[PDB]
């Protein structure tokens, strides 16, 4: 393996070495930069991997990773710099998940303005992991507008869903944002639009949320947009999964592929907890 | 590592897409070509803003037909109007043949590939645009050394992507031993959309506007007359519909195409049309006087 | 989507035969046989019988039906003019003219009477003899008086100047006759199709030989219809094959 | 839904590269078969894994899709040129009930 | 694939031959690889 | 010159070209972009196939000073011949949003290029108008009959589109709207029916207020414009004439065809009602048989 | 530089069916005798003057004739080059023939003089009257005002040195010496054998005066053209074609036929 | 491969009227395309040219390769021309009329 | 250069006012569209049209198109010799004129008489008697449209192509009426029926049959006059003698 295939190997190690927090630093040591330098995928994939070990527990670790991001963000660098910078940014997201620190918000912001191709994606996601559920209005407003400024597609994708993550659990207070994201003519803003409804109204079978997601799924010709709406249903109807197979029978009837891809995923999420015999039968 | 490339998808703007078509239809059967003016950003977006057409040769498309002398002159003209940026490749037009690069087109491309490594070759088919879908595809040379190390998989990872086809045959052969094809998305802003949509001065001059009542008398007369004939086949037909197997009945007593469905369609089309014909008729009489 | 594919540009094939009902075999007018998809919302009951057909340009799919009236060799004269001559401008051969009003005129109008006696219908009509004899004059005459569609070829209107042109003409005239029956097919001279011997050791024979063989096949089908069977004329008396006279 | 989404699968089919009507003159047992595409040339060419070269026999009319020139399915309806020959010959239908004495 | 069958007019013994296909074009071929000069004799049907 | 002028057929590539060249000069805040218009003319319908930028400056403080580079245009035309040598200069695009009277002075310069009276095309870049967002004008010199001297003036030419066959499949290709300003189904045509009536309301309102201006604000009388408005009255329909009674009788005729057809569709559906009802009668047998059968299956699956 | 790209090899070959003609009115429509309908155009149906060509790919193409080739150099039956991948006429070419025809052409046959044809003095003087002297003393055909003889037959018993005299004394005087054979004229392809008589006389007329020495004369020296069930209708067909190209038809006086025969 | 052709007529490339570009007859003798312009009064177009007929039955005008000269190439002689763009590469033994003749040698 | 070549067909059969069937000159019959920049009433059968190669839509109507073989035949009209120059056979000139030159000049007096205007002359005699000279003498003096066609030079190598030549030759003489078509040395394609020999004998028959129906049948002629020059008329099919 080489390229991103080699990237995959190094960040898979930190799915395996999840937990055993004391020995997480140790096992990741010779793949961390300063003892690895053979390939830029290994050096970054240890940062992605290291975050995974410390996910949900990573308050100390957040400080340690933060030096590397500030270092390489006075530059936009070369593309070698990007692969390294990319795995630092996903890593601090995971470490600081649910923390609500402003330090991490601000740090990744300097990455986002570099406009790095792959690190911009990982920063955009990272803001959303750190600041899950807070509802800071400054965070919402800057991301949305920046989405139109950026010309790299990955960065838009990353921004769009990360807004959803920040407006988690906030229900009807997130309602104003939902309307701007849907009103757009940019597919990415709609792709992320679906997910904002999914996470804010998550686990409460609010009828208004399911209606938007349904209408949008059908009514847009754009492929990402369709797909995303379908996957969103599972999040909403997490509590009342009794109703999910009868609602989504419809989407699996239709022979558009992106629809059908998302229909499966919606059954995956919804009946994840405990199998429902019907769910399996529709997926066959 | 060396330097490691991944997928790209070529974003052909609305202005460029029509321009390529215009040039390709006009010079056919002769192969027509031209340079792509654009800008390259990201690692996944090749933005082709505009094209222009290079003078054609009877010696087709080749290494010596491009003309770099006329390019340098063309470049300055774009320079003074702010419409220069940086050249991102070339296009040419084959006629009745698929999207694929000929042996001569490999050698043309190889010279572009040295100058900019992110050079694309875009094949337009204009004799195959007679369908409701315009078949267009893009290619980009993968280096001879690369194929030995089998680095075509390297380009496929990091998304599922469309992995769309619209042509094979010659294309897939050439793919194995040279190039990697790129999928096509088209860019357009929310201004460009409205221009595209509007193709009528009959937006407000098409509901009060109407066809003479002679022509409506013809539609009424044809429609009523024919539905008798569909109705006589349906009568022969439904003397059955009580034997064994639907599929048999359809062959033997001519259930084919469904005469039941065919009568519904013919009735629905004229029924909806006359509501409009009256609806516009009365609207004019009452509002205008 | 599918309506733009239905419309033009289209090359004309001919439906040779079925092998499925959503897949057929056509020979196009490029001089190639193609296996093609067959689009729905079209005929299935004049489609499958040999008849002219539209196929799309480069895709090679049967996307439209083309009436058995169109792409014909010539059109009926039961809805145009007939040659305006009468059998009162025929002077002599009243003796030969008795047998031919017997062939044409009497089963066209009085088909019931032949079944009533139990006598077979009349069949094809041969006019043969040296060219002084007035053969044509009577055919022109009887076509006006009998009040039926009149059709028409000559065997150098079955000219093959493209490959597989010539057998397509045979299928055109006969299918058309059946459709607007009662009808009469005239083949003006057949000294090129009616050649006693053949070579078939070169390409130029075999196209004509195929015309002759197809000609025989459709006259055998033609029987027991209220059409009058082919009027035809020859020069010599030994143009005729023992196959075209049987 | 049944009417609109059948059509979209049907667009692929109509947009075929073309396909030809050949007949196998004789088999080669390396899973290649000598197939004379009938208005065109002779070609020795591999088959699909839907058919075997012992289901194909000389005088098998087959379909073969020119993108590799590879045989798909056999023609389920063959017609012999021997039918065309028998027609010329002609047998009048008669038993011993049309003679007597 | 496929194997374009032509009919061999004649070889010149130097590692080339003139063939005339049934599909009609004539081609100046090479006798080269898994084929010999003794296996090729007029009127034979050769595999291109 | 040529006096043959009728319509301006405009290709979609022309429309898009002037929006693009405006946005890549990034001219805004009422700063303009004037380029060349290319195409066929010496012809009654003026046929604009393509257009390209020309370097152009417009001064906004004083509007009576502008930059046009005469050298560029000739060079540029030569390179147009490379592309397609059926193109010559037949006019110029303006970037809108409207007609200006400083356009009269620009116009002089392009008479030493053309073989026709030069074309003025407003490509509105903000895409405003209830139909097409282009007005089209041509410069005429004429005596004025309201007792004043010979003016040079821009008289309106209608705008329509025709395009290449090739271009036409591309326009549709980018687009994915279902349209509501073009006609399709019944419901679509009701939406267009209403749009047309409100269109009429808008233009007609403007006529009443135009009349108001002449005699209270004092726009100059122009006999040529008001003269068509008189003809609106003479060609106007009337009520209770034997023409407007034919108009009712024709409605009664068409309504009867609609009645038979609604009823034909009802035949078809009552047959489809009986058919599915037979399907249910059939499926009843299967249902009965299934229950006795499922008895045997339950015990076996529990055994394993 | 554009023109030179197109001019460069290769290019396709067509003949000129006819020159159709179209008005130079591009300021509305063409109306030579065919009025144009619908829409008015500069140059999509209101084009300039026209050339119809027949290609060798088996088609015919209707183009506006090229503005660089004049309408005087286009006349029906000219052979002109045409662009290989379009179809515009670049240039004019001299009419090509078959390779059977190019065989007929001179190889510069050497003289062997009449003195090395021993004996037979009177016959040589008669044969010289026939071929040599209407060319030379063409001063005398213009004075006297007689017509030229269109050929001299040399017959007799075989082996009397017919062939040798002809070869020798034709090469002696200076004129085009064509090499044509009677048994050649009958070929296995129908009506190609006739065509080959027309190409031989064509070659004589470009290079006129020419003497066409026909070796043998008894292949086409067939006393039959009343036949019965044979391929002999092809044989006698090229005898009749010989008579049509010895039929007056202008610039044929200059061009003679020598012919040797044994029967 | 090479597309097998066969030459049908040597039309020598000077005196073919393969310059029409210069429309001037005031310059040159104008008996040939190299005598269309008298400044050089010499080569402005290839010295020798050829008309071939392919065995797909399509005639094209082809010229001189870089390894053949007109000593090598003659009328009636088979040639091989490059398959994609036609231009004489290599001369071949006389005619395609030969076939039974190759039997007769024993 | 920039005005590319378009392929020519002719209309076989109007199917509709938007859809026309053409037979091209590449071979294929198409259903083609119409561009609405030309007529739709001058598209009738037999009408020469050019159509596009890159959407196969009719661009425009064209006058008729006539073969270079029949253009060769017309460009032969030379021989400036007068009817004076026929010595001895001046009687034969009065006789020749009855059939050909009096209905040619004025067919109106032959209507009063009440017979069909006649056409056709056979010149037969033992050779060297100036049957060709007679053709060149009447070509000189009247000065009409003439077709001097060798009748064995209208056949060629290809098949069905000898029907195309002569069909359009009658097309030419109908247009440029009054026209006389000189068939000179008509004995090869004037031959007996045959057809128990080679395929050549069947080529004469297919061309001969095209000539018969085109002259008299359900197409007649009416101001075209035939002069047939044959050497012997015992070489001839009785159909053509008739
Ligand atoms: N019975 C008749 N009464 C009147 N005219 C006649 C009669 N018989 C023959 N004719 C005339 O003789 C001429 C030639 O005869 P016709 O046209 O019928 O030829 P045919 O015998 O079919 O020759 P072929 O063998 O070429 O077919 C015509 O003008 C025709 O009107
Ligand atoms: N009179 C002669 N003087 C010299 N040599 C002669 C003479 N007669 C015959 N020959 C020789 O015999 C050869 C054969 O005669 P040639 O071919 O010239 O003439 P011919 O009468 O047409 O006979 P054929 O056609 O039967 O060969 C001559 O080429 C020459 O070598
Ligand atoms: N009646 C005449 N008056 C004067 N000169 C004549 C006369 N008859 C013939 N000639 C001369 O004879 C020449 C040859 O006659 P021509 O070839 O035309 O004859 P034909 O009888 O058609 O024979 P064939 O077609 O078999 O050659 C004329 O060019 C002329 O010089
Ligand atoms: Mg007859
Ligand atoms: Mg001799
Ligand atoms: Mg004569």
């Amino acid at each position: 393996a080489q390229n991103w295939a080699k990237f995959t190997a190094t960040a898979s190690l930190g799915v395996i070495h999840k937990g055993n927090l004391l020995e997480g630093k140790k096992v990741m040591a010779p793949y961390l930069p300063g003892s690895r330098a053979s390939s830029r995928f290994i050096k970054g994939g240890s940062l992605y991997g290291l975050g995974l070990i410390y996910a949900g527990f990573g308050r100390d670790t957040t400080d340690y990773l933060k030096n590397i991001i500030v270092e390489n963000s006075g530059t936009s660098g070369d593309e070698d710099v990007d692969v390294l910078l990319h795995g630092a940014s996903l890593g601090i997201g995971l470490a600081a998940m649910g923390s609500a620190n402003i330090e991490v918000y601000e740090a990744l912001k300097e990455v986002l303005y570099n406009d790095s191709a792959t690190s911009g994606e990982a920063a955009a996601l990272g803001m959303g992991l750190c600041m899950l559920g807070t509802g800071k209005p400054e965070a919402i407003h800057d991301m949305f507008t920046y989405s139109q400024e950026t010309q790299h597609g990955n960065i838009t994708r990353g921004l769009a869903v990360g807004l959803a993550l920040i407006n988690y659990g906030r229900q009807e207070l997130a309602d104003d944002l939902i309307t701007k994201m849907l009103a757009s003519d940019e597919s990415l803003l709609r792709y992320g639009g679906a997910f904002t409804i999914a996470l804010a109204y998550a686990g409460t079978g609010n009828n208004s949320a399911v209606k938007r997601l349904l209408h949008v799924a059908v009514s847009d010709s754009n492929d990402d947009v369709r797909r995303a709406a379908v996957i969103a249903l599972g999040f909403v109807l997490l509590r009342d999964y009794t109703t999910v197979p009868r609602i989504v029978q419809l989407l699996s009837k239709s022979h558009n592929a992106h629809v059908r891809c998302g229909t499966a995923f919606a059954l995956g999420i919804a009946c994840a907890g405990k199998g429902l015999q019907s769910a399996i039968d529709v997926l066959d | 590592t060396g330097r490691d490339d991944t997928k790209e998808t070529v974003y052909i703007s609305s202005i460029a897409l029509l321009k390529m078509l215009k040039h390709g239809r006009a010079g056919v059967p002769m192969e027509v070509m031209g340079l792509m003016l654009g800008e390259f950003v990201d690692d996944y977006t090749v933005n082709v803003v505009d094209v222009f057409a290079m003078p054609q040769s009877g010696t087709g498309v080749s290494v010596e037909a491009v003309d770099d002398v006329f390019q340098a002159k063309m470049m300055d003209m774009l320079k003074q109007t702010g419409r220069d940026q940086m050249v991102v490749g070339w296009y040419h037009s084959h006629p009745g043949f698929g999207c694929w690069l000929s042996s001569v087109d490999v050698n043309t491309q190889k010279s572009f590939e040295q100058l900019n490594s992110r050079a694309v070759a875009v094949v337009v088919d204009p004799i195959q645009s007679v369908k409701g879908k315009v078949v267009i595809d893009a290619f980009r040379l993968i280096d001879t050394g690369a194929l030995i190390n089998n680095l075509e998989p390297r380009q496929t990872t990091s998304n599922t992507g469309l992995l769309n086809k619209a042509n094979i045959q010659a294309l897939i052969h050439g793919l194995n031993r040279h190039y990697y094809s790129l999928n096509i998305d088209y860019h357009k802003t929310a201004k460009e959309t409205k221009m595209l949509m509007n193709l009528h001065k009959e937006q407000w001059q098409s509901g009060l506007k109407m066809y003479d009542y002679e022509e409506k008398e013809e539609s009424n007369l044809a429609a009523t007359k024919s539905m008798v004939k569909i109705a006589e086949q349906y009568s022969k037909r439904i003397e059955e519909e009580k034997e064994l197997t639907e599929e048999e009945l359809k062959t033997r007593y001519v259930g084919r195409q469904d005469p039941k469905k065919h009568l519904s369609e013919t009735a629905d089309e004229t029924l909806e049309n006359n509501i409009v014909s009256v609806l516009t008729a009365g609207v004019n009489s009452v509002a205008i006087k | 989507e599918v309506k733009r594919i239905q419309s033009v540009p289209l090359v004309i094939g001919q439906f040779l035969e079925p092998i499925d009902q959503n897949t057929g075999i056509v020979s196009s007018t490029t001089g190639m046989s193609y296996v093609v998809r067959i689009l729905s919302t079209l005929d299935r009951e004049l489609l499958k019988p040999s008849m002219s057909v539209a196929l799309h340009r480069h895709s090679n799919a049967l996307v439209d039906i083309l009436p058995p009236d169109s792409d014909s060799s010539i059109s009926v004269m039961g809805e145009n003019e007939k040659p305006d001559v009468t059998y009162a401008d025929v002077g002599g051969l009243d003796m030969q003219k008795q047998e031919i009003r017997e062939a044409v005129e009497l089963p066209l109008v009085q088909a019931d009477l032949y079944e009533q006696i139990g006598i077979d219908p009349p069949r094809g009509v041969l006019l043969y003899g040296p060219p002084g004899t007035g053969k044509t004059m009577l055919v022109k005459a009887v076509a006006n008086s009998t009040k039926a569609a009149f059709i028409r070829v000559n065997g150098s209107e079955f000219v093959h100047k493209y490959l597989g042109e010539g057998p397509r003409m045979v299928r055109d005239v006969f299918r058309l006759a059946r459709e607007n029956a009662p009808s009469i097919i005239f083949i003006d001279e057949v000294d090129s199709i009616a050649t006693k011997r053949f070579d078939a050791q070169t390409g130029s024979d075999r196209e004509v030989q195929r015309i002759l063989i197809e000609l025989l096949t459709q006259m055998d089908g033609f029987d027991q219809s209220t059409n009058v069977k082919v009027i035809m004329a020859t020069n010599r008396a030994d143009t005729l094959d023992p196959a075209l006279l049987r | 839904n049944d009417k609109v989404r059948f059509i979209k699968d049907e667009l692929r089919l109509l947009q075929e590269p073309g396909s030809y009507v050949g007949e196998v003159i004789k088999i080669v047992s390396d899973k290649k078969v000598l197939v004379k595409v009938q208005p065109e040339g002779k070609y020795i060419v591999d088959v699909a894994k839907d058919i075997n070269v012992k289901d194909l026999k000389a005088s098998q009319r087959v379909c073969l899709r020119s993108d590799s020139y590879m045989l798909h399915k056999v023609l389920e309806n063959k017609a012999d040129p021997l039918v065309s020959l028998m027609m010329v010959e002609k047998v009048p239908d008669s038993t011993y009930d049309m003679v007597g004495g | 694939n496929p194997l374009s069958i032509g009919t061999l007019e004649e070889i010149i013994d130097d590692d080339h031959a003139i063939v005339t296909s049934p599909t009609m074009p004539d081609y100046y071929v090479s006798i080269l690889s898994f084929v010999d000069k003794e296996l090729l004799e007029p009127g034979c049907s050769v595999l291109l | 010159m040529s006096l043959q002028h009728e319509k301006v057929t405009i290709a979609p590539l022309v429309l898009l070209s002037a929006l693009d060249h405006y946005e890549r000069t990034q001219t805004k805040e009422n700063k303009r972009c004037v380029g060349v218009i290319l195409g066929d003319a010496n012809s009654s319908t003026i046929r604009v196939t393509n257009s390209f930028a020309l370097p152009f400056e417009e001064d906004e403080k004083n509007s009576d000073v502008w930059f046009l580079d005469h050298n560029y245009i000739e060079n540029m035309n030569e390179m147009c011949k490379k592309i397609n040598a059926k193109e010559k200069l037949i006019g110029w695009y303006h970037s809108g949003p409207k007609l200006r009277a400083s356009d009269l002075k620009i116009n002089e310069l392009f008479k030493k290029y053309t073989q026709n009276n030069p074309l003025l095309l407003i490509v509105d870049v903000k895409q405003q108008g209830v139909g097409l967002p282009t007005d089209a004008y041509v410069a005429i010199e004429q005596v004025k009959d309201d007792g004043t001297s010979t003016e040079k003036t821009f008289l309106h030419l209608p705008c329509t589109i025709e395009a290449e066959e090739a271009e036409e499949i591309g326009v549709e290709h980018l687009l994915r709207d279902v349209r509501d300003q073009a006609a399709g189904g019944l419901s679509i045509r009701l939406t267009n029916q209403l749009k047309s009536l409100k269109g009429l309301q808008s233009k007609l309102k403007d006529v009443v207020e135009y009349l108001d201006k002449v005699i209270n604000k004092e726009l100059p009388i122009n006999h040529t414009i008001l003269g068509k408005l008189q003809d609106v009255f003479n060609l106007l329909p009337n009520l209770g004439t034997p023409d407007d009674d034919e108009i009712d009788v024709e409605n009664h005729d068409r309504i009867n065809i609609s009645n038979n057809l609604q009823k034909a569709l009802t035949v078809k559906t009552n047959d489809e009602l009986m058919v599915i009802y037979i399907s249910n009668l059939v499926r009843s047998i299967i249902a009965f048989d299934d229950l006795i059968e499922n008895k045997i299956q339950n015990k076996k699956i529990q055994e394993q | 530089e554009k023109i030179k790209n197109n001019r460069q090899l290769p290019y396709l070959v067509a003949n000129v069916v006819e020159v159709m003609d179209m008005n130079e009115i591009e300021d509305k429509e063409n109306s030579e005798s065919t009025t144009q309908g619908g829409n008015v155009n500069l140059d999509n149906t209101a084009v300039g003057k026209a050339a119809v060509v027949k290609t060798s790919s088996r088609q015919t193409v209707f183009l506006p004739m090229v503005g660089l080739v004049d309408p005087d150099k286009l006349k029906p039956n000219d052979l002109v080059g045409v662009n290989k991948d379009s179809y515009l006429i670049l240039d004019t070419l001299p009419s090509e023939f078959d390779s059977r025809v190019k065989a007929m052409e001179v190889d510069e046959k050497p003289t062997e003089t009449y003195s090395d044809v021993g004996g037979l003095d009177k016959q040589i003087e008669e044969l010289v009257e026939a071929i040599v002297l209407p060319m030379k003393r063409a001063d005398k055909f213009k004075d006297m005002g007689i017509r030229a003889p269109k050929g001299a037959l040399m017959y007799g018993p075989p082996g009397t040195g017919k062939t040798l005299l002809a070869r020798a004394c034709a090469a002696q005087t200076n004129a085009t010496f064509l090499k044509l054979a009677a048994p050649q004229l009958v070929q296995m392809y129908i009506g190609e054998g006739a065509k080959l008589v027309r190409d031989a006389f064509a070659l004589a007329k470009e290079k006129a005066p020419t003497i066409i020495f026909i070796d043998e004369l008894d292949a086409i020296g067939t006393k039959r053209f009343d036949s019965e069930k044979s391929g002999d209708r092809e044989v006698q067909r090229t005898m009749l074609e010989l008579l049509n190209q010895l039929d007056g038809f202008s610039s044929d006086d200059r061009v003679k036929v020598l012919a040797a025969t044994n029967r | 491969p090479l597309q097998v052709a066969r030459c049908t007529k040597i039309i020598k490339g000077n005196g073919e009227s393969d310059e029409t570009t210069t429309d001037n007859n005031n310059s040159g003798n104008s008996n040939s395309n190299s005598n269309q312009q008298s400044t050089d009064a010499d080569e402005d177009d290839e010295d020798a040219k050829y008309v071939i007929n392919l065995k797909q039955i399509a005639k094209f005008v082809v010229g001189l390769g870089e390894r053949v000269s007109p000593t090598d190439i003659e009328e009636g002689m088979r040639v091989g021309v490059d398959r994609s763009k036609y231009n004489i590469e290599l001369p071949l033994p006389p005619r395609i009329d030969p076939s039974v003749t190759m039997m007769t040698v024993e | 250069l920039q005005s590319i070549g378009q392929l020519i067909g002719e209309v076989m059969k109007e199917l509709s006012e938007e859809k026309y069937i053409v037979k091209a000159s590449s071979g294929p019959r198409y259903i083609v569209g119409v561009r609405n920049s030309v007529d739709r009433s001058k598209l009738k059968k037999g009408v020469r049209v050019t159509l596009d190669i890159t959407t196969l839509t009719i661009m425009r109507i064209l006058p008729r198109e006539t073969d270079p073989l029949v253009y060769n035949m017309t460009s032969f009209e030379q021989g400036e010799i007068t009817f004076d120059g026929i010595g001895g056979l001046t009687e034969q000139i009065r006789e020749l004129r009855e059939v050909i030159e009096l209905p040619l000049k004025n067919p109106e007096i032959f209507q009063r008489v009440g017979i069909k205007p006649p056409k056709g002359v056979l010149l037969y005699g033992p050779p060297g008697t100036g049957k060709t000279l007679l053709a060149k003498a009447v070509a000189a003096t009247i000065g009409a449209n003439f077709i001097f066609s060798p009748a064995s030079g209208i056949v060629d190598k290809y098949i069905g192509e000898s029907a195309r030549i002569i069909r359009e030759m009658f097309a030419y003489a109908k247009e440029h009426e009054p026209c006389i078509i000189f068939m000179d040395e008509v004995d090869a394609i004037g031959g007996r029926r045959f057809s128990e020999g080679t395929s050549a004998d069947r080529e004469i028959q297919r061309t001969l049959m095209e000539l018969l129906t085109q002259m008299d049948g359900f197409d007649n002629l009416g101001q075209t006059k035939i002069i047939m020059a044959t050497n012997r008329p015992d070489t001839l099919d009785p159909a053509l003698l008739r």
Side-chain angles (χ1 to χ4, degrees), chain D residues 23 61 79-86:
Chain D
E23 64 189 291
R61 307 200 299 107
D80 290 311
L82 309 174
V83 187
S84 301
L85 302 158
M86 182 61 168

Side-chain angles (χ1 to χ4, degrees), chain C residues 89-92 129-137 189 234-235, chain I residues 212 239 242:
Chain C
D89 291 346
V90 170
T133 51
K135 290 176 307 301
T136 318
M137 178 62 157
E189 274 312 316
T234 58
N235 178 260
Chain I
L212 292 174
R242 191 208 67 206

Side-chain angles (χ1 to χ4, degrees), chain G residues 147 243 247, chain I residues 85-87 89 126-133 185 231:
Chain G
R147 57 155 194 160
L243 296 175
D247 189 68
Chain I
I86 304 308
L89 299 186
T129 62
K131 312 183 267 298
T132 331
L133 194 73
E185 316 279 63
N231 297 326

Side-chain angles (χ1 to χ4, degrees), chain F residues 16-29:
Chain F
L16 292 166
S17 291
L19 174 64
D20 191 39
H21 297 179
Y22 176 80
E23 278 191 77
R24 293 185 297 164
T25 42
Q26 199 175 221
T27 48
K28 50 197 168 166
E29 297 297 311

Side-chain angles (χ1 to χ4, degrees), chain I residues 31-88:
Chain I
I31 295 165
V32 290
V34 265
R35 190 181 177 226
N36 66 340
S37 295
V38 295
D39 290 81
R40 288 192 165 148
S41 53
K42 285 194 176 49
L43 297 176
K44 63 177 85 197
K45 319 180 292 194
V47 184
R48 284 305 173 145
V49 294
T50 188
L51 46 154
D52 199 26
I53 61 187
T54 184
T55 309
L56 315 185
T57 183
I58 305 165
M59 289 298 273
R60 52 195 170 270
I61 79 284
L62 294 172
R64 214 212 289 123
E65 281 171 68
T66 42
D67 299 65
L69 269 301
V70 62
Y71 261 94
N72 188 218
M73 307 326 176
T74 52
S75 170
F76 295 142
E77 262 178 75
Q78 307 166 252
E80 42 75 70
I81 214 186
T82 50
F83 261 136
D84 195 57
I86 304 308

Side-chain angles (χ1 to χ4, degrees), chain E residues 8 10-18 28 31 37, chain H residues 78 92-93:
Chain E
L8 168 60
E10 54 177 321
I11 64 187
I12 323 162
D13 296 324
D14 39 41
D15 295 306
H16 296 73
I18 311 81
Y28 192 62
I31 313 179
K37 291 181 187 140
Chain H
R78 286 187 305 178
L92 307 179

